[PDB]
From Swiss-Prot, chains B, D:
Residues 192-342 are extracellular. Highly expressed in roots and at lower levels in leaves and siliques. Expressed in seedlings, cotyledons, roots (e.g. root hairs, epidermis and cortex cells), stems, leaves (e.g. vascular bundles and hydathodes), and siliques. Expressed in root phloem. It is found in: Cell membrane; Plastid, Chloroplast membrane. Glutamate-gated receptor that probably acts as a non-selective cation channel, at least in hypocotyls. Can be triggered by Asn, Ser, Gly and, to a lower extent, Ala, Cys and Glu. May be involved in light-signal transduction and calcium homeostasis via the regulation of calcium influx into cells. Plays an important role in the calcium-based fast transmission of environmental stress. Acts as a negative regulator of lateral root initiation and development. May restrict primordia numbers and position along the root axis by a signaling process originating in the phloem. Disruption phenotype: Impaired glutamate-triggered (and Ala, Asn, Cys, Gly, Ser-triggered) membrane depolarization and calcium rise. Slight reduction of photosynthetic yield of Photosystem II. Overproduction and aberrant placement of lateral root primordia. The chain holds residues 483 to 880 of 959 of the full protein. The chain crosses the membrane at residues 132-152, 154-166, 171-191, 343-363. Induction: The induction by glutamate, gamma-amino butiric acid (GABA), malate, aspartate, acetate, wounding, touch, and cold stress stimuli is abscisic acid (ABA)-independent, but calcium-dependent. Cold-mediated induction is rapid but transient. This is Glutamate receptor 3.4. Belongs to the glutamate-gated ion channel (TC 1.A.10.1) family. Glycans are attached at residue 94. It comes from Arabidopsis thaliana. Forms a heteromeric channel with GLR3.2.
Length: 375, 365, 375, 365
């Protein structure tokens, strides 16, 4: 093959982004190579597939405070300050136009990570729709009416239950009938209004729910997704909030959309699978990937090293060592199937009726103990 | 550029408001600048964006006891006692008529602050479904169908109450039971559709809910929103109550509308974010910005020093420095923030009917 | 007073907007003055209050196809192509900065005009929540059960109504009880679900409801309100739809938010009071004015004719002739109080119970005719 | 500008797709240009914005029977049989890898079209509140409390059904009646919260609702969305069904998924607006644009003629001419577009229990 990479004093200026969060893909290091992460060693393993002994260098790009803007990093490959950008560079439609990429060594897609549904189930959830002061007064003004039925008339007390089945005490019964009819509808409304607002809360089941909800959306700093959601999804820039690091990415969702926080974070798929292992079982990609392109190495435009390394990636992809390096660093995977595309429907709490029928079980057994007490 | 600011024996007469409350934006200071606050430091950096060395002074305007009228402070720039007014001057139309502002360096809006309150009404809120004409139609036809019991028969009325509880007259029981079964669902469906939307209406408020309610309205001392609601919203001046400092903004709302206090203070947006940070979240912005203009610096009219200081604000804002100045002083976002049932109306009917029966038992005994 | 307007060959270049819709304020005309409308004669009446015999001209600005952009018209006063703009120029905060205005001869405010609530009231509204095929089958499977009660057992037919008040036919009654219990809840839900969606439809009760509803909003062509709702209210430009003329302004609201239409039109107050007289009783300003500034005449910046005509307006405002000219053209006023800030609450249809109790009145009278038939 | 397009004996080889369906964007023509459609007239005006006289020709690419693969049409620009491809070429990544596009002159997205359909399910939708474990808990404890009737007493079970309808055992009637009264409201509140949100969920659809449902998917002939869903969305190719023309887009959805037809055609946004204008509103876009890129013109890679033709699109669009060209061809917005009850499940139970009683009456008679 006619190209020979020259043997001269200019090295290969690998541009390295200076990542603050997600130091497992690419990061600053104290070692004699100088850089650490995943795509570094991916780029390292691509060297031995080529017959070129390649001298090179590693230049960190951003600061040590926040993530570097890759569109500025791509421009520094356009401006020929660098020879090649190696990192988490996502193939975006401008970026394809201005520089040259390889084949995607890995795939990726923009996801929506969001807090999961925490739905309660208790005997408290059964007795929920009235106040604790209301459940005593309503039962209190049954016996308060029933004590007046005595004036119209434990073993002595059971006789009035026979007469309260179906003069002046009949007029007491008529108004007491209108009591129960409203408390029928009052419990009906107050349980409906809880089962409605629980369904009609601030929810998202995809990017389309997240666009039209006019809520603040979190992103990371220096990514395409800020200028992607503006230029494509028709989102106001005041919704889109950049965020610096993974310790901030949680507490912006621990606060939820309020306390200054955002509704949800839109990031790429392989960042979030690290984040799920980094977090507890509280979050999930609520939809599918809505922009699925992948990564790649940014080269100089019309570089002869492209088709060399484009073949080397596809060769190494067939050899399975790409997945073996993907086992060395990116072994962090856990499902914790909290919710799995759960249909929001009727779904009445199974423990809410663990509080009804077991108190009914107490009553039937207390009926049976007094039954044996006669025996 | 043709204009160069000359360096003669006269300095630049910056008008500074003698600010009493909210001393984070601007304040009297014992430093050798003599000034302290946000809009000072906003002004200082745009000086450093000029190609000019700018000799300048700072003069406090009003009395130290109360906040002065900024329109009179604007008027001194018209009266040429100052070269430029720097402070919390908010862009109003007749303020723009006489002096020339800069671009807005911050965004401010008129909001209404008011205490948070309960949502549940009286015993009559229990009765609120079924508009009250149709209760008399209900109870009227309730007894009118019960009059058909007495056809199909003090001693006769008890027999009319005997078959009322539980032939052709028992076919009348068939049709009426079908009716009141619907009325049971009709009162149910009306009650549900009230208690559902009242958990979704966060908009049950408004500036008009204050205008129509002829309540005492608190205002801060020396502001445009005093004269703004009078000329535009036509609100009576007896409703408008001035306030001099920050702690009086609380106690006039601690007392509520009664005890001499005010119901809802109409102040600007960036002031309320300071004060709600200072307190607990017992006080709420009942709506949104009903008049949103923003602040600005007021040079004397047709002065070329306004022009480059306008563009210097644009260059400094797009750089991202005003926000860094903002976090230096106002990084203050410390803001906190199901369904149940409580009423008393039907249990009064539990009290009326039951003690009535004791008298008849006392009249029998 | 030291100023004297000169007696020379240059006339007074009055800039006149070429209005397509609302030709009652200012319009092209075939007359020797050349222009027609309201603010023309307002400007005409301001001349005789000044002691200056003023020669002048009238220049139409826009085309005959759509309304001219007044910010371009104000710029043509800045660019000194014109001496004065006379028309519907609203005092906006840039416009105060770049030119000089008079005092407002009239006041105005941005309103929200919107379709009114049409709520139905009928005996059909009573029998609404089931299908017409359902109201016959449900009543059909009462007598279908009741015909089996005959096998357990008009003047002969009335006997089973006595036995259906409260063996194997008792087992028929138990399942028939479970029929009515569900149809109780089935009518309860289907009437709730109609009374809920009627409340939770696409509604607006102010500008704040109209901002957060992310709906298309109509405006007129060449106004500040397009660049006002963007720069202040934080509204996406794809919602804001300009519209050319008053025959289009109706059919964009006759279609509602769908069929390509918009949700509501935001215009100034004096345009909409013409539009209400121009329309039937179908629309109303649903809120108060949320941006209330008024009109004025745009002058050259630092013109001596300002304080002359600023005094002349305030003089004529005190004389009441300003309202008399406001009677010559702007006499079009009608209320037609369809809805007047109506509280959306319980409000159960009075004619829905005109269908219940009158059929109950038929039944009670048919009971009384057979009562007299025995007599 | 350094480059000038030379005027030698060779013209500009515009690749034109031999377009069969949707002949409003581009079509074979008998005119002396030989071309007719939208993207032609979009191309012609940006020629007139150049400082150049541009000699040019037009060649139809594919067969007139079917729509050709545009990727092969893109490949001929790579194969240098054409100088530039002009048509409905949509910007894809590997399409951008080999040739150089212009800026997008129109905005297109992938949508899914499908017929409108009913929302009500079977007799089991009547039973859908109360998850089916809790019906057996209901009916199990319904008869278990009815077993306490028989303690407090074929002839004995009828007496157990006698007191079941309407002492210490009558105190058991007190507590159980309180329970089933709640269950009446619990089934009511569960049914209401289903029939309320199902009038608010317009989002009960999706591309994933087609992916998981392993349905036949119709595609147009010679498109990227054929190969797009295969490589990206991993959908099996047996689901994918090609279609050659416009009338076959209807009849494969007239037949539905069965009778050999397809369930939902995935085509681009500006095609669907043509076709839904052509038909009645029986066919719906089930969601939004799940892949939105836009069209473009494809010059040969690293040709300077792409650069000025890119900026000419920007100058012509901001002038407002592309929309006037758009109304000349596609001014087509002709698009049309309460709650009730219908089910059959409980009336089958009306059929089961009643005809069972005729047998016992026949067994008695
Ligand atoms: C499209 O991508 C490019 C590069 O990221 C941007 O276009 C120009 O790129 C050059 C680099 O040679 C810069 O000098 C220009 O300033 C860029 N122009 C603009 C307007 O930014 C451009 O930012 C991207 N476009 C979008 C919409 O994100
Ligand atoms: C709008 O602002 C102007 C400018 O201050 C006000 O006009 C001044 O009013 C004071 C009141 O005593 C007087 O000095 C003059 O009448 C004006 N001063 C000038 C012209 O220098 C005007 O009153 C304000 N409008 C309203 C409604 O208050
Ligand atoms: C504010 O109003 C002015 C006047 O219409 C606009 O500012 C500039 O006005 C000059 C007139 O000499 C024009 O030549 C400039 O093009 C205008 N600037 C811009 C950026 O267009 C200005 O547009 C208005 N502000 C807004 C937000 O619309
Ligand atoms: C993306 O486009 C390229 C360019 O056409 C495709 O590569 C070609 O594939 C055809 C298949 O027969 C062959 O001619 C060559 O392998 C390629 N031609 C070239 C490089 O000129 C590529 O296959 C497309 N991607 C996918 C996933 O189909
Ligand atoms: N995938 C993103 C990452 C940006 C970042 O890490 O800051 C990109 O390539 O633009
Ligand atoms: N923005 C107000 C502030 C008034 C005050 O702080 O007293 C004004 O300029 O009038
Ligand atoms: N009041 C609007 C009217 C605009 C118009 O009529 O086009 C303005 O002055 O800008
Ligand atoms: N936008 C599609 C159109 C395909 C077609 O019309 O057949 C493409 O470029 O592939």
């Amino acid at each position: 093959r006619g190209w020979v990479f020259p043997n001269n004093g200019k090295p290969l200026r690998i541009g390295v982004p200076n990542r603050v969060s997600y130091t497992d893909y690419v990061s600053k290091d104290k070692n004699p190579p100088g850089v650490r992460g995943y795509c570094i060693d991916v780029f390292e393993a691509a060297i031995e597939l080529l017959p070129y002994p390649v001298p090179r260098t590693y230049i960190l790009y951003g600061d040590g405070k926040r993530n570097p803007s890759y569109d500025n990093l791509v421009n520094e490959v356009v401006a020929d300050n660098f020879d090649v950008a190696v990192g988490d560079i996502t193939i975006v439609t401008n970026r394809t136009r201005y520089v040259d990429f390889t084949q995607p060594f890995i795939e990726s897609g923009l996801v929506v990570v969001a807090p999961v549904k925490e739905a309660k189930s208790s005997p408290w959830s059964f007795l929920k729709p009235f106040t604790i002061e209301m459940w005593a007064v309503t039962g209190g003004f049954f016996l308060f009416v029933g004590a007046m039925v005595w004036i119209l008339e434990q073993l002595i007390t059971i006789f009035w239950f026979s007469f309260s089945t179906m003069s002046l005490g009949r007029f007491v019964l008529i108004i007491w009938l209108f009591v129960v009819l409203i408390i029928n509808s009052s419990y009906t409304a107050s349980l409906t209004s809880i089962l409605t607002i629980r369904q009609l809360t601030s929810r998202i089941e995809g990017i389309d729910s997240l666009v039209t909800s006019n809520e603040p959306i979190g992103v990371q700093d220096g990514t395409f997704a800020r200028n992607y959601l503006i230029n494509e999804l028709n989102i106001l820039p005041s919704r889109i909030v950049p965020l610096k690091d993974e310790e901030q990415y949680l507490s912006a969702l621990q606060r939820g959309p309020n306390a200054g926080g955002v509704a949800a974070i839109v990031d790429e798929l392989p960042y979030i699978e690290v984040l799920l292992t980094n977090s507890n079982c509280k979050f999930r990609t609520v939809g599918q990937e809505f922009t699925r392109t992948g990564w790649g190495f940014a080269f100089q435009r019309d570089s002869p090293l492209a088709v060399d390394m484009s073949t080397a990636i596809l060769q190494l992809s067939e050899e399975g060592e790409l997945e073996k390096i993907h086992r060395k660093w990116l072994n962090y995977k856990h499902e914790c199937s909290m919710q799995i595309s759960n249909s929001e429907d009727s779904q009445l709490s199974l423990k809410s009726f663990w509080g009804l029928f077991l108190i009914c079980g107490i009553t039937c057994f207390m009926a049976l103990t007094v039954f044996f007490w006669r025996v």
